[PDB]
Amino acid sequence: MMNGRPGHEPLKFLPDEARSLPPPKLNDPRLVYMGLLGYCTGLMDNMLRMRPVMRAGLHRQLLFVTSFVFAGYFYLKRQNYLYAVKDHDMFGYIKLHPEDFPEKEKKTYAEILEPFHPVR
């Protein structure tokens, strides 16, 4: 739905506005989870091909980990940008259309009479 958003660049992974967002930590739980997925990928690769496990393909395992992290960093950056854009447009729309999102003013529990439902 955000494809028709104005200024939307076609096939731009990371526009220049996204550089104003803060990046990840590089210690994020999800990037280390992706590294763990890469390690398990190497382990499964060795298990399938009748190879030792945690001993055989240390260059392959390192490559799996690094590929997963090096992809997850940029994909997570893109997703952060997209969610930022969501909040941005939502805020702009409520600020442009306050008649539809009025300044509601709620009441207290002394003035409203909620009904009683015994258990007995």
């Binding site: 709620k106 009441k107 207290t108 529990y109």
Partner: peptide
């Protein structure tokens, strides 16, 4: 107290 408290 809750009587001085807003719904929500």
């Amino acid at each position: 107290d809750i009587t001085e408290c807003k719904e929500g």
